Amino acid sequence: AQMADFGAAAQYLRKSEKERLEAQTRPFDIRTECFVPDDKEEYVKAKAETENGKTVTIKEDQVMQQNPPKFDKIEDMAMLTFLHEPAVLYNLKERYAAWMIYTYSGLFCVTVNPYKWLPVYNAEVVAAYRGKKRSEAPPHIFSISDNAYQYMLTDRENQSILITGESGAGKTVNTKRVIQYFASIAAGTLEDQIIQANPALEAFGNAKTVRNDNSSRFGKFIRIHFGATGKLASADIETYLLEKSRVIFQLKAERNYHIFYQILSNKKPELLDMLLVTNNPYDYAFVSQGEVSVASIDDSEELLATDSAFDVLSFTAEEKAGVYKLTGAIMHYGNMKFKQKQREEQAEPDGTEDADKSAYLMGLNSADLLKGLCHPQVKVGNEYVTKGQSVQQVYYSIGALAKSVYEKMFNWMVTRINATLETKQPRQYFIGVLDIAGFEIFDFNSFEQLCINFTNEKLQQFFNHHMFVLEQEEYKKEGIEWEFIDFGMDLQACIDLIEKPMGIMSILEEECMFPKASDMTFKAKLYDNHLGKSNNFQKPRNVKGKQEAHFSLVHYAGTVDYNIMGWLEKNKDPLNETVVGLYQKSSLKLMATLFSTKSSFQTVSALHRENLNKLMTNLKTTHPHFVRCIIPNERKAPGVMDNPLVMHQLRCNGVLEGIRICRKGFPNRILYGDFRQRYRILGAEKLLGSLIDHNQYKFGHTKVFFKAGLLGLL
Amino acid sequence: TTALVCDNGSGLVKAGFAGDDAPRAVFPSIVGRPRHQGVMVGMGQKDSYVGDEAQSKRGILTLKYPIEHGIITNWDDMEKIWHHTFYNELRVAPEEHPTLLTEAPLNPKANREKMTQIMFETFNVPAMYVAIQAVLSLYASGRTTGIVLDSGDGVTHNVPIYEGYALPHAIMRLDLAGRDLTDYL
């Protein structure tokens, strides 16, 4: 009835009731259709004797009863009697096979990349979701965009869309589709404008990753602002915590942000003539750490895209030559050289080639810069006194200066984009579109992975709190008296060692301050404070033949193993205020604009924690709506999705945590009439006072609640 | 599965794997404890240092040998030294290797009883064995007949062997060795 109005896409949105009725009545068994593991499928159906193409006999306490054939295609795995990994896995597998890329997961909105053009979004024939609710219409992200619209118009409270970002595709197309939809419903457009200046962000905040080649290395919080009544207004972009540690140090088999090699592809010899810079990447230590180039992308055409971006951007000739000069200076910093003065201690420079280069570039003096690098001044009450500097201290300061310059330039460019993309009446409300990396579990995890997983722990706790208050509200609504320990925070608040003032980060800062501290002393301190005294902190099981870890954290997405080698040098961030004062006087007006606005204690972890606190503070004032874009397969061939990839992702994406919590229900929530009908073979009071346990149900105001493992009996 | 050889001695631990040509780890059989105050807050003070780590920090430590005259007279320190030898020097798991300990002749029975009890309980070795130092010295010399004079850090002993037969009534054990010469010097 309400499905045949979507045309050629309705089959993808809601299958016709004919094949549905023939499929919802399959005769199968309860005790010969279970789930057993595998090495290439990791989960299979079979008939303990079990065979589906290969015989395996396993313990009788590891098999998962397969979902009943009643719910074998439901787009909402929150109502299943069997909430386990293979259940939802094959649920999604089937729903994608019989093409339906859209699904609901308790509160998430899982979308799968189809890789095949579909009219399921265009034209508006499918966009009829206006006025429609999630609980009635098919499970489309358009329903969620519309729900956020409705909530803004009826509640005057901002809304937020948290889309999973480490997936290479699916996320970007979904962002395009949701901004298009928001332009459509509440109608040189905001979509055009937003996608115009994107090459800037692509070149500045994306780098070659071990498990990617175009990786969002920051947080993009696109705010689409709406008028007083719900009319589209301007849209500003806001950036959050950026992995600035890469600007100097890159692991082996990775490289920093694209812009460096984009410039160094010798595409515009004008630039490589202006910045006194050659083209060989192995001459600059700040870029030649890992690999200089990947074969999966060109640099010249992307350089042209970024040039055209600066042109469509409000940048002039100076606001572009200055940026190129700053990047050239960031490269020239990498190979300045200092030596301990003969016979006492002091770091002094030997050769000033890159010194003069960078001094001319940023618009400073060379002798003044060298002196301010080797002799930083400080204000003692009312007087200034020179402070001594060793070689390693000079290098740390140089790195800190490079990182500060890069982040300042990034933020200024984002402000310029906000300016050129904003002209509108004073508006009230907006919708939050949050792009950010997700959880990571690599073969070799390090400081950056720890920071990213910490941020994702925070976001996941946010989602858990939202879902907890939702379920608690719904229980107070149906009069169902049932109270439980907070499903929101009390899960990760103990995996928040990383922030409490004795955990890993505080210990790392302490070790950054302490004399002669090394990695071994850092490991010793970690062990003395946590090994045995905490349950989430565990010693890794290091097997010879695999990379050596040093400790293991029990995250929500599994137990990750970290290798702390080098965290000390990576956490130090001593800013040299003398050189910053030199910057504030430069001739290159972009540099002075950057550093326009009675210190040696700065660490990357501290700035990161403060930025994360600010981001969570912003999010905690709005209403969230989460989306889980998935890459189904790696060979790009549509239709068939590999099971281990999608299983790992379903772990890291955050859906499995929601499943694990709703399993503590009462996941199955039905009214009276449906059970009165489908199980009348003999309202619900007498129908269930006859048989099972008396706690598996709690009736209230035409609502029955069933725990996971009861409809597998009916 | 390979086996471990752990010639203890009273002045030097020599450990390794059965089949090599020389011990893989050779360090002093010593345990040091700090005697002075300790002021730098956060320096990560260890309770005790073993092996040759206690030898480089010896300026601030008080050193103790847990073996006096071939006899183990401090079983906690000896357990520390064995734990070090297995986990930090050889870097193995004692649960996967038979261990061949060594002992001097004519020393109390409780010594070997405690050795084997320590091994089997607090290390869970699959099997063990306690040899006599002079017999092994004769193995290494490539002979089956001779009177071997072993003289280490704690005890000097002769063991006469003939055609692979020991003469236990002619074993003579003397109790001056390297350490008494060090003290006399």
| Full 3-state SS string of A203-259 | HHCEECCCCCCCEECCEEEEEEEECCCCCEEEEEEEEECCCHHHHCCCCCCCCCEHH
List CB contacts (< 8 A) between A528 and chain B: 44
Q: Which amino acid is at B18?
A: A
Interaxial angle between packed helices A300-312 and A318-333, expressed in degrees from 0 to 180 and rounded to the nearest 10: 140
Phi-psi map region of A625: left, alpha, beta (phi>0 left; psi -120 to 50 alpha) = beta
- What is d(CA A81, CA A438) in angstroms, rounded to the nearest whole number? 29
Which residues have C-beta within 8 Å of that of residue A31, sequence separation ≥ 6?
A: A65
User: Which strands make up the sheet holding B49-50, listed edge to edge?
Assistant: B49-50, B31-34, B61-64
Classify the C-alpha dihedral A372-A348-A279-A257 as positive or negative. negative
* Alpha-carbon gap, residue A447 to A503, rounded angstroms: 14
Instruction: Tell me, letter by letter, the H, E, C secondary structure of chain B.
Output: CCCEEEECCCCEEEEEECCCCCCCEEEECCEEEECCCCCCCCCCCCCCEECCHHHHCCCCEEEECCECCCCECCHHHHHHHHHHHHHHHHCCCHHHCCEEEEECCCCCHHHHHHHHHHHHHHCCCCCEEEEEHHHHHHHHHCCCCEEEEEECCCCEEEEEEECCEECCCCCEEECCCHHHHHHHC
Active-site residue, selected from the candidate residues A167, A175, A453, A464: A167
Cα dihedral A669, A675, A677, A678, rounded to 10, equals: 90
In whole angstroms, how far apart are CA A1 and each of A4, A15, A16, A673? 6, 12, 10, 21
Which of A:456-515 have CB within 8 Å of B? 510, 514-515
Output the CA–CA distances (angstroms, integers) from residue A121 to A24, A97, A125, A174, in the order listed: 28, 19, 8, 10
| Cα separation, A382 vs B139, whole angstroms | 80
| Cα atoms in the Cβ-side hemisphere of radius 13 Å centred on A510 | 18
Q: Which of B135, B122, B123, B6 is nearest to B67 (CA)?
A: B6
**Alpha carbons A204 and A246: distance in angstroms, whole number:** 11
CA A508/CA A571 separation, integer angstroms: 8
Nearest C-alpha of chain B: how many angstroms from A525? 7
Provide Rg for chain B, Cα atoms.
18
A172 labelled catalytic: yes
Catalytic residue, chosen from A363, A438, A654, A665, is: A438
| A187 exposure class (CB count in 10 Å sphere: 0-12, 13-18, 19+) | exposed
HSE at residue A7, side-chain half, CA atoms within 13 A, is 12
Phi, psi torsion values for A126, nearest 5 degrees: -90, -20
Q: How far apart (Å, rounded) are the C-alpha atoms in residues B81 and B12? A: 11
Chain B positions touching A519 (Cβ under 8 A) are none
Across the interface, do B44 and A510 touch by the CB < 8 Å criterion? no
B-chain residue closest to A522, CA distance: B44
CA distances from A671 to A662, A697, A701, A702 (A): 18, 12, 9, 5
Q: Which helix (H) or strand (E) holds A607?
A: helix A604-619
Q: Confirm or reject contact between B44 and chain A (CB < 8 A).
A: yes
Q: Who's near B182: CB < 8 A, 6+ residues apart?
A: none
Catalytic residue flag (residue A212): yes
Q: What's the CA angle centered on A134, arms A129 and A136, to 5 degrees?
A: 85
Residue A385: in which H helix or E strand, if any? strand A383-386
Q: Is B44 in Cβ contact with A524 (below 8 Å)?
A: yes
Residues of chain A in contact with residue B44, where contact means CB-CB under 8 angstroms, are 521, 524-525, 528
The candidate with the shortest Cα–Cα distance to A550, out of A561, A558, A560, is A561
Amino acid in position B175: D
**B180 C-beta neighbours (distance < 10 Å), count:** 14
The answer to whether A548 faces chain B, any CB pair under 8 Å, is: no
Task: Please name the residues between 505 and 534 in chain A that touch chain B, using a CB distance below 8 Å.
Answer: 510, 514-515, 521, 524-525, 528
In the set A212, A288, A415, A611, the catalytic residue is A212
From B100's Cα to the closest Cα of chain A, the distance in A is 24
- Kind and range of the H or E run holding A571: helix A567-571
Q: How many CA atoms lie within 13 A of A614 on its CB side?
A: 12
Three state DSSP letters for A646-663 = HHHHHHHCCHHHHHHHHC
Question: How many whole angstroms separate alpha carbon B107 and alpha carbon B114?
Answer: 13
Binding residues of A for ATP: 165-172
Task: With beta carbons under 8 A apart, name residues in chain A contacting B43.
Answer: 514
Q: Which amino acid is at A712?
A: G
Handedness of CA A518, A520, A522, A524 (dihedral sign): negative
User: Is the CB of residue A353 less than 8 Å away from at least one CB of chain B?
Assistant: no
How far apart CA A650 and CA A657 sit, in angstroms, is 9
Whether residue A168 lies in the annotated active site? yes
Task: Give the number of C-alpha atoms closer than 13 A to the C-alpha of residue A310, restricted to the C-beta side.
Answer: 17
d(C-alpha A350, C-alpha A342), whole Å = 12
CB A302 within 8 A of CB A262: yes
Hey, is the C-beta of A62 within 8 angstroms of any chain B C-beta?
no
Give dist(CA A416, CA A422) in Å, integer: 10
Phi, psi of A608 (to 5 degrees): -60, -45
Annotated binding site of A: 165-172
d(CA A339, CA A336) in angstroms, rounded, equals: 11
Asked whether the beta carbons of B171 and B157 are under 8 A apart, the reply is: yes
Method used experimentally: cryo-EM
Subunit contact B44:A521, Cβ cutoff 8 A: yes
Distance CA A240, CA A435 (A): 10
Name the resolution in angstroms. Answer: 3.0
Q: Identify whether A571 is a catalytic site residue.
A: no
**CA neighbours within 13 Å on the CB side: how many for A122?**
6
* CA–CA distance, A260 with A281 (Å, rounded to integer): 9
CA distance A35 to A12: 28
Q: Which of B43, B49, B92 to mutate to test the interface with A (most CBs of A within 10 A)?
A: B43
Whether residue A440 lies in the annotated active site: yes
Nearest Cα of chain A lies from the Cα of B28 at a distance, in angstroms, of 23
Of A67, A75, A160, A168, which one is the catalytic site residue?
A: A168
3-state secondary structure of A674: helix
Q: Are B44 and B51 in contact (CB under 8 A)?
A: no
CA quadruple A240, A241, A246, A250: dihedral positive or negative?
Answer: negative
For A516, counting Cβ atoms within 10 Å of its Cβ (0-12 exposed, 13-18 middle, 19+ buried), the class is exposed
Of A374, A312, A314, whose CA–CA distance to A347 is shortest? A374
Asked about A131 being catalytic, the answer comes back as: no
Both tokens of A552, joined, read: 């293991």
* Annotation marks residue A216 as catalytic: yes
Close Cβ partners of A361 (under 8 Å, ≥ 6 residues apart): A275, A276, A325, A326, A328, A329, A332, A588
Omega within 30 of 0 (cis) for the link into A666: yes
Dihedral (CA of A681, A685, A686, A690) sign: positive
Is any Cβ of chain A less than 8 angstroms from the Cβ of B42? yes
**Nearest 5°: phi and psi at A112?**
-115, 140
Give residue B54's Cα distance to chain centre: 17
Distance separating alpha carbons of residues A307 and A309, to the nearest angstrom = 5
Rounded Cα distance between A215 and B19, Å, is 52
**SS3 category, A98:** coil
Q: Give the separation between CA B17 and CA B96, rounded to whole angstroms.
A: 12
* Six-digit token string for A556: 């929500």
Structure token digits, residue A603 = 């660490």
- Tell me how far apart the alpha carbons of residues A480 and A497 are, in angstroms, rounded to a whole number: 35
Window 122-161 of B: residues touching A by CB (8 A cutoff) are: none
| Residue A70: half-sphere exposure toward Cβ, Cα within 13 Å | 13
A215 is catalytic: yes
Contact B42 A528 (CB under 8 A): no
Which residues have C-beta within 8 Å of that of residue B1, sequence separation ≥ 6? B96, B97, B98
